[PDB]
Homo-oligomer: 75 residues x 4
């Protein structure tokens, strides 16, 4: 679960479901500029060119981030 | 201009001023867990452990992001 | 796909097979410090703390790298 | 500091001198596709499009890497 979306109501970064994270990450690795996914009766588009998620039912925009692991890894 | 903060009023990622971007990036590269800066006579702290900017007067939290350069570089 | 090992004979970075790349990347995302994989019966270990692949039949150490895609993505 | 070159005699990644690391990192941040630097009587070019250091006299190719900081930062 490496992708996150920001919830401005709670003021915290939130995780995607395992399947939505996998849909987003597969599109990210394939070079697509955007990806759609469904969660709890809403369709969303993650726009990779702006790092913003758009709720396609309401139009609400929430920022997204990709977590990055340290290189090299610590012992 | 590698650091950005999300403005939920405009629905867009926003750039820091050149000096605030430099202040934030120098603290990021030094391994600090947070950094202080001011903009428009207001004080903020960027918390690197949560990737959020905190308005010190209101407590309002806005997300932040670091732009990343491709490795390897494209020709 | 995203992991590469350096071939000193040819002087080039080389891709892994889709299956070996998936094995390495799953272990990378799970926080493991190392991962074993095979190319047929030939055994290898990728040591994430040193970013080196050890050929477990010859003992030869080849460096490894993880490709990093640009954030945000270009249009 | 943050750039490293692979020493296949010892089988390990090695650091650049502080000045060579600064020269490489300044060219990296400026969008250049390559950078030249010296170490005593040795002359090198780091090719960012292939992540390889080339000895200008002999053509010997040593792979390079850029260390990456975790995002978000750990406490
Ligand atoms: O729709 C809203 O108000 C807020 N919201 C999102 O932005 C979002 C993104 C992904 C998932 C998921 O389960 O993967 C759930 C949600 C969710 O509830
Ligand atoms: O939260 C607010 O008060 C709104 N707001 C910010 O969050 C912020 C951060 C950076 C700069 C800058 O000039 O570098 C300006 C602003 C700004 O207008
Ligand atoms: O000459 C060798 O055996 C290998 N070798 C290099 O490729 C190299 C590159 C930069 C520096 C430095 O001091 O910045 C040191 C060396 C070094 O020792
Ligand atoms: Cl939403
Ligand atoms: Cl090598
Ligand atoms: Cl070998
Ligand atoms: Cl000499
Ligand atoms: Cl050399």
């Amino acid at each position: 679960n490496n992708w996150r979306w920001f919830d401005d109501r709670s003021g915290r970064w939130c995780s995607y479901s395992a399947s939505n994270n996998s849909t987003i990450d597969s599109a990210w690795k394939s070079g697509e500029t955007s990806v759609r996914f469904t969660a709890g009766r809403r369709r969303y588009t993650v726009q990779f060119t702006t790092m913003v998620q758009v709720n396609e039912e309401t139009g609400n925009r929430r920022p997204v981030m990709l977590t990055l692991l340290r290189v090299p890894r610590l012992n």
